[PDB]
Amino acid sequence: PGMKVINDPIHGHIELHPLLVRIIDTPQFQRLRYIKQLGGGYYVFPGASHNRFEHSLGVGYLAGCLVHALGEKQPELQISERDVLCVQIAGLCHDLGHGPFSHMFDGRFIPLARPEVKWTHEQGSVMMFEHLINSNGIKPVMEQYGLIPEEDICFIKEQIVGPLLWPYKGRPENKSFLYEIVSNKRNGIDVDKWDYFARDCHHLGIQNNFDYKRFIKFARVCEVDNELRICARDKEVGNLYDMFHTRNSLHRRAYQHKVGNIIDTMITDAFLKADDYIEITGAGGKKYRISTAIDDMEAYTKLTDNIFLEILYSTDPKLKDAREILKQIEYRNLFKYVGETQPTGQIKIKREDYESLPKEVASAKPKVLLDVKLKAEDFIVDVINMDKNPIDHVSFYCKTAPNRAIEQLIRVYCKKVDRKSLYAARQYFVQWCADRNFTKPQ
Amino acid sequence: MKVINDPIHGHIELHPLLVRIIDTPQFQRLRYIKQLGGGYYVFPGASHNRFEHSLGVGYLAGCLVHALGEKQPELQISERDVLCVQIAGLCHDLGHGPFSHMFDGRFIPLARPEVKWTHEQGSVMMFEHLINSNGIKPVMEQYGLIPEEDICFIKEQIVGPLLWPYKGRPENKSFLYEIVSNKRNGIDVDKWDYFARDCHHLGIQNNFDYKRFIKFARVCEVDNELRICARDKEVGNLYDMFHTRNSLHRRAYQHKVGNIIDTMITDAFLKADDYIEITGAGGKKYRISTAIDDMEAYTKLTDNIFLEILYSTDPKLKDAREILKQIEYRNLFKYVGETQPTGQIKIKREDYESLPKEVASAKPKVLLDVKLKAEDFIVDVINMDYGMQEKNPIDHVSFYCKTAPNRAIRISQLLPEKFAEQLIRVYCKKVDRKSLYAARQYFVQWCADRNFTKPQD
Amino acid sequence: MKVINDPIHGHIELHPLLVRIIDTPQFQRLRYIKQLGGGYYVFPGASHNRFEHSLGVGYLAGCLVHALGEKQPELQISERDVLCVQIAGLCHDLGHGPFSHMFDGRFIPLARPEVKWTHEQGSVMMFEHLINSNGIKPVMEQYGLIPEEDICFIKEQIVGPLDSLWPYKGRPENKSFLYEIVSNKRNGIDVDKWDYFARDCHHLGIQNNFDYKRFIKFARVCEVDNELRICARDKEVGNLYDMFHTRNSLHRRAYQHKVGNIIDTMITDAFLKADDYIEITGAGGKKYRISTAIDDMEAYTKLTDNIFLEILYSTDPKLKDAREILKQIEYRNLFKYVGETQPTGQIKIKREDYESLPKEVASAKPKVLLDVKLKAEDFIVDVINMDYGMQEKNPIDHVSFYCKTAPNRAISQLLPEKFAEQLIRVYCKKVDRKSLYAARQYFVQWCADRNFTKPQD
Amino acid sequence: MKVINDPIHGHIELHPLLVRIIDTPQFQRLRYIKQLGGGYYVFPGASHNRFEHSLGVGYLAGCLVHALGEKQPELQISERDVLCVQIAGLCHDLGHGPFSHMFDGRFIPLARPEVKWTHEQGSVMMFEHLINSNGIKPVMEQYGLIPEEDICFIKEQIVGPLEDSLWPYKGRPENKSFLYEIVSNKRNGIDVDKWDYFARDCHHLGIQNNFDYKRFIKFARVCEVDNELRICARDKEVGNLYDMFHTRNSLHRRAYQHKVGNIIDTMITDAFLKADDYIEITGAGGKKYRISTAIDDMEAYTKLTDNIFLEILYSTDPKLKDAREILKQIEYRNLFKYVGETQPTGQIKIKREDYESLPKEVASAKPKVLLDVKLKAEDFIVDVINMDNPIDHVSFYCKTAPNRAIEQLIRVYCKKVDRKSLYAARQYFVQWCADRNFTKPQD
Numbered sequence A: 001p002g003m004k005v006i007n008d009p010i011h012g013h014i015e016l017h018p019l020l021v022r023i024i025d026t027p028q029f030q031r032l033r034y035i036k037q038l039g040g041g042y043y044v045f046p047g048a049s050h051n052r053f054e055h056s057l058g059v060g061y062l063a064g065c066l067v068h069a070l071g072e073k074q075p076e077l078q079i080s081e082r083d084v085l086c087v088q089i090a091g092l093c094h095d096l097g098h099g100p101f102s103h104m105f106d107g108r109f110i111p112l113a114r115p116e117v118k119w120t121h122e123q124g125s126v127m128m129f130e131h132l133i134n135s136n137g138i139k140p141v142m143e144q145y146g147l148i149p150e151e152d153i154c155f156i157k158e159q160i161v162g163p164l165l166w167p168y169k170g171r172p173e174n175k176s177f178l179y180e181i182v183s184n185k186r187n188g189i190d191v192d193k194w195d196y197f198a199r200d201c202h203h204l205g206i207q208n209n210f211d212y213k214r215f216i217k218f219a220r221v222c223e224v225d226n227e228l229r230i231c232a233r234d235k236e237v238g239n240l241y242d243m244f245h246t247r248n249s250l251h252r253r254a255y256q257h258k259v260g261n262i263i264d265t266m267i268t269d270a271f272l273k274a275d276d277y278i279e280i281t282g283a284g285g286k287k288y289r290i291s292t293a294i295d296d297m298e299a300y301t302k303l304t305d306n307i308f309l310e311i312l313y314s315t316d317p318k319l320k321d322a323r324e325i326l327k328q329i330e331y332r333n334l335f336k337y338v339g340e341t342q343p344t345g346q347i348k349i350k351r352e353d354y355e356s357l358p359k360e361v362a363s364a365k366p367k368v369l370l371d372v373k374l375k376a377e378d379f380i381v382d383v384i385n386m387d388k389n390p391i392d393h394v395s396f397y398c399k400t401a402p403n404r405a406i407e408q409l410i411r412v413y414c415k416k417v418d419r420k421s422l423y424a425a426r427q428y429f430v431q432w433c434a435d436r437n438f439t440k441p442q
Numbered sequence B: 001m002k003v004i005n006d007p008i009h010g011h012i013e014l015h016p017l018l019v020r021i022i023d024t025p026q027f028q029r030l031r032y033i034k035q036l037g038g039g040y041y042v043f044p045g046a047s048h049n050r051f052e053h054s055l056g057v058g059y060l061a062g063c064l065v066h067a068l069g070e071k072q073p074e075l076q077i078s079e080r081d082v083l084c085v086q087i088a089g090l091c092h093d094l095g096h097g098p099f100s101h102m103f104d105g106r107f108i109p110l111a112r113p114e115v116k117w118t119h120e121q122g123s124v125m126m127f128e129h130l131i132n133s134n135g136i137k138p139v140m141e142q143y144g145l146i147p148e149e150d151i152c153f154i155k156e157q158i159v160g161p162l163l164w165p166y167k168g169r170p171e172n173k174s175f176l177y178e179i180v181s182n183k184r185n186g187i188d189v190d191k192w193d194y195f196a197r198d199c200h201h202l203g204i205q206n207n208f209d210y211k212r213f214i215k216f217a218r219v220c221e222v223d224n225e226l227r228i229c230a231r232d233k234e235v236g237n238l239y240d241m242f243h244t245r246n247s248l249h250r251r252a253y254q255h256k257v258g259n260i261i262d263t264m265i266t267d268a269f270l271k272a273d274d275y276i277e278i279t280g281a282g283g284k285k286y287r288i289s290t291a292i293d294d295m296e297a298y299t300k301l302t303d304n305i306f307l308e309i310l311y312s313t314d315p316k317l318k319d320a321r322e323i324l325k326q327i328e329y330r331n332l333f334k335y336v337g338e339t340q341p342t343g344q345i346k347i348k349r350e351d352y353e354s355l356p357k358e359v360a361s362a363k364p365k366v367l368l369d370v371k372l373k374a375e376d377f378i379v380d381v382i383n384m385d386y387g388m389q390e391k392n393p394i395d396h397v398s399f400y401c402k403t404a405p406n407r408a409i410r411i412s413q414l415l416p417e418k419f420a421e422q423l424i425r426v427y428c429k430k431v432d433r434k435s436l437y438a439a440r441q442y443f444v445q446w447c448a449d450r451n452f453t454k455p456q457d
Numbered sequence C: 001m002k003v004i005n006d007p008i009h010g011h012i013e014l015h016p017l018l019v020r021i022i023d024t025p026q027f028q029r030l031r032y033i034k035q036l037g038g039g040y041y042v043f044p045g046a047s048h049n050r051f052e053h054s055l056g057v058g059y060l061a062g063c064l065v066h067a068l069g070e071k072q073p074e075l076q077i078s079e080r081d082v083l084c085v086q087i088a089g090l091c092h093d094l095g096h097g098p099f100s101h102m103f104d105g106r107f108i109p110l111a112r113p114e115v116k117w118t119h120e121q122g123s124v125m126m127f128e129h130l131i132n133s134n135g136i137k138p139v140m141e142q143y144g145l146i147p148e149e150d151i152c153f154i155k156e157q158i159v160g161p162l163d164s165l166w167p168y169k170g171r172p173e174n175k176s177f178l179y180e181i182v183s184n185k186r187n188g189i190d191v192d193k194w195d196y197f198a199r200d201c202h203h204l205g206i207q208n209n210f211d212y213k214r215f216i217k218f219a220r221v222c223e224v225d226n227e228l229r230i231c232a233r234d235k236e237v238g239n240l241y242d243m244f245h246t247r248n249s250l251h252r253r254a255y256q257h258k259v260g261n262i263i264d265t266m267i268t269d270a271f272l273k274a275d276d277y278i279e280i281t282g283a284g285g286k287k288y289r290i291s292t293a294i295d296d297m298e299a300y301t302k303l304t305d306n307i308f309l310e311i312l313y314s315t316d317p318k319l320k321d322a323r324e325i326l327k328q329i330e331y332r333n334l335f336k337y338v339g340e341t342q343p344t345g346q347i348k349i350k351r352e353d354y355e356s357l358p359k360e361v362a363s364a365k366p367k368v369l370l371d372v373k374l375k376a377e378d379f380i381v382d383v384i385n386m387d388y389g390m391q392e393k394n395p396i397d398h399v400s401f402y403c404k405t406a407p408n409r410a411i412s413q414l415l416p417e418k419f420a421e422q423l424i425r426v427y428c429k430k431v432d433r434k435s436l437y438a439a440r441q442y443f444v445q446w447c448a449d450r451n452f453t454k455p456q457d
Numbered sequence D: 001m002k003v004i005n006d007p008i009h010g011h012i013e014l015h016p017l018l019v020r021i022i023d024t025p026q027f028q029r030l031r032y033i034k035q036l037g038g039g040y041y042v043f044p045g046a047s048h049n050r051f052e053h054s055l056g057v058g059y060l061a062g063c064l065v066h067a068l069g070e071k072q073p074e075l076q077i078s079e080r081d082v083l084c085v086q087i088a089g090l091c092h093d094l095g096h097g098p099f100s101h102m103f104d105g106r107f108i109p110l111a112r113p114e115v116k117w118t119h120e121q122g123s124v125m126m127f128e129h130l131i132n133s134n135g136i137k138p139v140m141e142q143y144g145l146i147p148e149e150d151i152c153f154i155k156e157q158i159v160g161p162l163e164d165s166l167w168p169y170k171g172r173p174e175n176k177s178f179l180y181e182i183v184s185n186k187r188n189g190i191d192v193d194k195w196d197y198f199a200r201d202c203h204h205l206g207i208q209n210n211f212d213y214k215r216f217i218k219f220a221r222v223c224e225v226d227n228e229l230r231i232c233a234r235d236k237e238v239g240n241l242y243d244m245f246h247t248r249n250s251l252h253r254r255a256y257q258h259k260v261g262n263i264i265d266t267m268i269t270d271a272f273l274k275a276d277d278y279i280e281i282t283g284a285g286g287k288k289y290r291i292s293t294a295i296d297d298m299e300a301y302t303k304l305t306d307n308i309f310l311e312i313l314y315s316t317d318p319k320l321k322d323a324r325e326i327l328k329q330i331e332y333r334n335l336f337k338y339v340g341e342t343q344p345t346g347q348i349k350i351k352r353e354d355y356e357s358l359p360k361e362v363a364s365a366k367p368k369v370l371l372d373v374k375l376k377a378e379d380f381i382v383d384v385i386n387m388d389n390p391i392d393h394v395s396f397y398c399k400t401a402p403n404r405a406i407e408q409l410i411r412v413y414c415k416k417v418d419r420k421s422l423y424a425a426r427q428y429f430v431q432w433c434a435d436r437n438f439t440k441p442q443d
């Protein structure tokens, strides 16, 4: 069986089964070369040039390592070569659905452009994966290696987006542990996070003391509360604490960076101003816009970070408004940071209300008379989401007896950089916080 | 003063003047040009761009001058000098085009053989455009720079002298010209960065330590010229440098599939060249091969042109697109063989275009079952350093003693052999079993009458 | 199967047999002896003991055989061999005494000039004492070792052969490369040095540019003049140059430290003054003294750095003279430094003459005669050897390299000059301005009369 | 001025006054006491001693005062202050006994339950003894120190206020309050002492340390917080502090709280107790003290170091046979076996005075199904491990507007290693937990 070997800066040599190679070499997979992992992060962190493509190879690699390690150590689990491939394909394809600049796309842009629509890149990954297998005739290739397509493709989608009393149609309840590999949000520990923790740390120059190889050699499937779940050896606990500290550090230092997130709302603002005028040719030659390409995977296949440059380089005076914001990024005249607040206890601010937020802020009236008035378009309101002692939700096992177990941050920016426009914005913002019952700004 | 965190160097502090230069459309362009060109399509970690490389070299440039200045106040290194050395480091790669070395090393030679073009020339041109467009000269004067001398100094550090040849600095500061680009012994801050950075991204170990070497550098008189010298105990570090360089050339820059892919991208650019319009100065329209003539058009020419071609519906570009679609589907030119010009004169850029027809015209002894025209051949010339003959860089490094600084130590089989090479590879665009068989002996016969080495089996 | 975490080597996995040997009074004894002896009284970070160094050498020893055995199966390296190399690594320093090299390099020579003793000899004796006392031989057999072949192999790996006939009884000549692992006296490259270079550096805060992991990765056993020997890959030459400079740095900065050595002679002076009065109970209940404790391993087992505090804390008025010298160390009233000389182009001083030396200094005739004169008891003469009883050799000569394309066959004033020196220093026990002036003149005359080099100012 | 090369801090410069203080039997003593005590028997890199740690803290304390005095000359920081903070840094651990925290944390409570003893108290006593014994007061005066003003300040920095809501410190006025936050800060637990041993313990244990103290010192400022002058961090140095706290948590989890490490420290303690009666240390006036009584006289205590371990191990004396055999069990690596772990239930802390009673409570527990072995109190070891988010108790300041701010673990070991003794000890232990209402031991 002919394997491709890929040298990876994080995992070293990655061997790829011919089936994975066929899936990798499609316009739909190669597309991920053109989407930055951290999006606007790159404009803060010069080392963060990495793309979704290499990350996905990693997740596919690690996904395989874990199933195979489990299968070798516990043959009773009945893990087939068919299972290993399906877990690897899920690992490979879990991010197919991301759009330009990754989380900026499904996390801010689509909510702003089309508030009524519900879209996640996970939903995209399932759609794009379906599009991928159909477009490139993957089903025969699967059958050749013993995969049964209607049976397994379902499994794969479920590993990505979740169940489409045992909710899963792709595998029976006795293999339930397989669903904990690629995406696990019970305890938020999975091969996806293992790759991007190590890979972001590598490109951001942040210290990562978590050893994922250790964790995989010692992973075991044990019965917990009637349920088969992946468990860690008890003395790997110190390792787990290192993982959680690495994750916290990536969030405070990188994902939540004040300038990083500012720049991402600027790229978003430019997309919104370009949305009317940009045409992406989809299936049947129909034309979609940036916000609608998610509706058709053929158009969406051509929607990547390139759209940034398409806007930047364009001559069309209709795109002038979009273009000048991107030029603002280039010249580094950025939105200025007004303040930060949290919603107290309560309910989370929701994506469908994102569009409404700047108008709420501008409609606040601070109690001292202010001689500057600011429109709602003068404001940017940025909703940043986060996800306890995390070690309690991890299940462990003892060596001597295995098979036995033992959040919203809200920032506001102003497009006006002169002092008393900025002074005004501050007053709007503190007042808005007061009457929406948010925490009082520093 | 801005601080930028970098995975190779850690914290890079930037003087306000540098920040002014960096925050321009001409510098930010380098975010959109991959360092290793087609390398990325082989090494998934090699997503890095010219931008971060440039910040790095500007930073290393600064570290080295500053280190010398503190250890040797007699050198009379001014703060004016250090900023100039930093800007040169920062701007040395400004002239790179889409996919870096693919552009000036193959594409331009194929498109416009008559023209002589290096990205270094581009960097000097682009640096001028950056300064004029963004009014940097007043900002230079503000910080104590004299624009007409210092701008010359900076350009000279990049492309060399435009009987002491340099107009930008006198002969007593000559050692400053050894920092950004050193052509004698190839030891400079530019290589230190991309050695460290490429290794970081390729997952190849770099055993050269630049911090050690910078700590111990001195300027000493050697053959009545001021030169940067290494202390004697650094000999081991320099050998590691020369070996890291070899690994990078052999494992990465010369990678067979990587270079095939660079010829596919180039083949795509050529087939797209007539029909693509880039808007330059005075609203004039330029092509990919022509964008080098105007810095305003060239500012808009980056790797993006690959995707512009790939996503395009225009049927005039269908041919360019079909090659780029081939790369995505991973049906690539197939590799015929490799040969070297031993004892003969190495192939020159102006002759690259002619090479495929020589191959198609070879006429092998046996009758062929399939005939191949030159459309079908790709001939790739791979140079370590183009237009440089072979030198042992260890010779041109001067060392100094603990007990006798300020004077060099007076001056093997374990070093890398080859420091400037020419490799000639041939690929065939037809992938069927008997077309390829044809291509091989066309190639073997082609080698024979140019008296190149007989391809190994 | 125990794993022990180490700050230099990370995780060290220990075969049960090694653990069994380690968990004995004779091995745990090494916890109580400082690696650098008096170095600690100058380098506060140098708290490390023989114990952790020995685990390291055991670890590195195992790493190298395994790397050789796995890459070159033709060498037929057995599990029996790997264990024996590990035991040798672990036990090579068993024989060190209180404050390490102070003990066999100075104290014993001064106490018993007649005796020829090395700590390596000690290691052989202590290893024998260890295996007998703790019933290791059955445990050896249990794991596939043949005790009187292997114990012999292990001892020979430590102390050497017990003309040009093959001297080793423990292993045949086709495995000869095994004897190059723990102790290599031809080129001074072995796992012992690797560990303490890295370990001493770590505690002294000195940078270690030698990477042993790399060297082990690339090591091969090849043909050299009839002879099977461990060889380095050609690209590792830079790493070996770094090893030699680190060694030179450690020797110059730490082992030859002025105060460090003054303090070790003070401790020795204390031991001598205490030697008559301290009984250590050995085998058969017989009583041994500090200097005779080397005669019986049961007594020697209880002889560690502890003897320093025993003397210091003692009430016995017999011990007051010894005690007072150790107390002067605490108060930092030390022997004062007179000067340094070398026996260049002369015959080097031998251990059996050490005691005679102060008498020679005190008997020199300095004159112009001075109003102060000194007895021999007022002088301390310190002989500092890089390698004792070893001729000056350049070690890169005697290292063989190999080429990739010829996997098996073997193929410098940028290097340290210095590989075997004798340094002779003189201290004076009297601290007044005029005695000190007198002692200098005695010393300068003594140098002249032995035709050693003239003391500097 | 002497320079000392140190593997953690690089070159450390020592003022002549400090050198005078260092070169005494009372300070040099710390060369003979392991930082991590029994830790060395688990972690071979942990050979470091109190001596080098104290130089470090003396060095860092100085770096911080000097950085403050220079960036804020309005703050009144004199050279007299800088020297006094350095001495406090230098001498803060003078009071540690054999194997450090084993001595004051377990041994002394077991030997003399009635006595209240901390090594910080020792440090103050030993420091007084150091200055008197060696004639340090004149030397202080040469360099501008006033001995009974300053000695008081130095002691206060170490043991805290000696003798409510008034300003408790006599050694410095309240406008110097920030000085008392440098060497020892109980309030928020961030000081030069921890910085040193976090970095030093990590270096010797091979644990990665991401906290950079040098940056933190560069950005430190004194600001007004609630009536009070206090040391503050620049606001986005918050990230550095999180790394410090992660290092602290890791060191407690991987090292200080290590199972075998602590077990061996109870074995050393058990040997000391059985040796206590018979060992004589000569104190002042030729008076003889015991291991446990040496804390009562600093001249005796001066000669009490890790050496006492070997004195026992090497002794021929048959009264010491019991002590010697325990230490021999350590050497042969036959160790007390781990029975279980529990935590006391809400609020209540087991107190040092009651430690002795704990093995007898356990042994007197009535496990309810009856078992074939009975165990004495001497068969049990009860080990109480005390813990020394945190960002809320740190005060920060803004760059643009500085001046203004923005449990217990209980383990049980059994000394008899035969299998069914262990089954028994387990049942004694689970039951003891039950009727003292501690958390139920995991299975």
Ligand SMILES: Nc1nc2c(ncn2[C@H]2CC[C@@H](COP(=O)(O)OP(=O)(O)OP(=O)(O)O)O2)c(=O)[nH]1
Pocket (backbone or CB within 6 Å): A042, A043, A044, A045, A046, A259, A332, A334, B002, B003, B004, B005, B019, B022, B023
């Ligand atoms: N100016 C600039 N900074 C960069 C770039 N890439 C990374 N950085 C680093 C430097 C600081 C950080 C962002 O700095 P900004 O220029 O956004 O500074 P700011 O915080 O918006 O403005 P200010 O510093 O005035 O508050 O990211 C770049 O291309 N230009």
Ligand SMILES: Nc1nc2c(ncn2[C@H]2CC[C@@H](COP(=O)(O)OP(=O)(O)OP(=O)(O)O)O2)c(=O)[nH]1
Pocket (backbone or CB within 6 Å): A094, A095, A098, A103, A104, A106, A107, A108, A121, A122, A192, A196, A255, A261, A264
């Ligand atoms: N700025 C921003 N960051 C986000 C958003 N959602 C998540 N992040 C941060 C938190 C984690 C990090 C990566 O997200 P995931 O944990 O989903 O990892 P991923 O591999 O990128 O996502 P997935 O595999 O689900 O596509 O990015 C968002 O909407 N906006």
Ligand SMILES: Nc1nc2c(ncn2[C@H]2CC[C@@H](COP(=O)(O)OP(=O)(O)OP(=O)(O)O)O2)c(=O)[nH]1
Pocket (backbone or CB within 6 Å): A004, A005, A006, A021, A024, A025, B040, B041, B042, B043, B044, B257, B330, B332
């Ligand atoms: N197939 C493939 N390989 C990749 C990719 N990215 C990196 N690589 C690595 C693995 C193999 C190497 C390129 O080799 P190819 O797969 O093109 O193989 P080839 O030698 O050209 O043809 P073949 O092996 O089919 O005979 O680079 C990718 O997207 N697809």
Ligand SMILES: Nc1nc2c(ncn2[C@H]2CC[C@@H](COP(=O)(O)OP(=O)(O)OP(=O)(O)O)O2)c(=O)[nH]1
Pocket (backbone or CB within 6 Å): B092, B093, B100, B101, B102, B104, B105, B106, B119, B120, B190, B194, B253, B262, B383, B384, B385, B386
């Ligand atoms: N594919 C390809 N690679 C090249 C060519 N010329 C050089 N290379 C390889 C060998 C070294 C590396 C570039 O080294 P340079 O010293 O030119 O460094 P650079 O930073 O890329 O360019 P600059 O000289 O402008 O700094 O890329 C070429 O024409 N084509």
Ligand SMILES: Nc1nc2c(ncn2[C@H]2CC[C@@H](COP(=O)(O)OP(=O)(O)OP(=O)(O)O)O2)c(=O)[nH]1
Pocket (backbone or CB within 6 Å): C040, C041, C042, C043, C044, C259, C332, C334, D002, D003, D004, D005, D019, D022, D023
């Ligand atoms: N004084 C002293 N120095 C130490 C100690 N530990 C390490 N050192 C370093 C500092 C200097 C070196 C020993 O130098 P000494 O002060 O003993 O000798 P010196 O340098 O000639 O000092 P001086 O000229 O004052 O006598 O070792 C210590 O405990 N006391």
Ligand SMILES: Nc1nc2c(ncn2[C@H]2CC[C@@H](COP(=O)(O)OP(=O)(O)OP(=O)(O)O)O2)c(=O)[nH]1
Pocket (backbone or CB within 6 Å): C092, C093, C100, C101, C102, C104, C105, C106, C119, C120, C192, C196, C255, C264, C385, C386, C387, C388
């Ligand atoms: N002070 C002193 N230093 C010595 C003497 N002999 C050697 N040294 C220095 C030079 C090297 C360093 C260690 O020497 P070794 O190579 O013997 O190494 P070791 O590991 O200490 O002992 P062994 O050879 O038994 O392993 O100590 C001596 O007699 N006195």
Ligand SMILES: Nc1nc2c(ncn2[C@H]2CC[C@@H](COP(=O)(O)OP(=O)(O)OP(=O)(O)O)O2)c(=O)[nH]1
Pocket (backbone or CB within 6 Å): C002, C003, C004, C005, C019, C022, C023, D040, D041, D042, D043, D044, D260, D333, D335
């Ligand atoms: N045996 C032994 N282990 C050591 C030494 N130094 C460090 N270690 C490490 C290796 C294992 C770790 C724990 O010690 P042990 O394994 O002896 O104790 P344990 O693990 O509780 O005993 P066990 O697992 O055999 O019941 O300590 C040493 O000198 N001897």
Ligand SMILES: Nc1nc2c(ncn2[C@H]2CC[C@@H](COP(=O)(O)OP(=O)(O)OP(=O)(O)O)O2)c(=O)[nH]1
Pocket (backbone or CB within 6 Å): D092, D093, D100, D101, D102, D104, D105, D106, D119, D120, D193, D197, D256, D265, D388
């Ligand atoms: N075994 C044991 N460890 C302890 C005890 N108290 C604290 N520890 C651990 C946790 C932190 C580490 C050092 O604590 P300290 O903050 O006291 O630091 P120190 O330098 O050792 O002592 P000091 O407070 O006098 O400076 O030792 C104890 O009572 N027993």
Ligand SMILES: [Fe+3]
Pocket (backbone or CB within 6 Å): A055, A059, A094, A095, A192, A196
């Ligand atoms: Fe992902």
Ligand SMILES: [Fe+3]
Pocket (backbone or CB within 6 Å): B053, B057, B092, B093, B190, B194
């Ligand atoms: Fe460059």
Ligand SMILES: [Fe+3]
Pocket (backbone or CB within 6 Å): C053, C057, C092, C093, C192, C196
């Ligand atoms: Fe050794």
Ligand SMILES: [Fe+3]
Pocket (backbone or CB within 6 Å): D053, D057, D092, D093, D193, D197
């Ligand atoms: Fe302390």
Ligand SMILES: [Mg+2]
Pocket (backbone or CB within 6 Å): none
């Ligand atoms: Mg291939």
Ligand SMILES: [Mg+2]
Pocket (backbone or CB within 6 Å): none
């Ligand atoms: Mg900024």
Ligand SMILES: [Mg+2]
Pocket (backbone or CB within 6 Å): none
């Ligand atoms: Mg164990």
Ligand SMILES: [Mg+2]
Pocket (backbone or CB within 6 Å): C259, C334
């Ligand atoms: Mg001295």
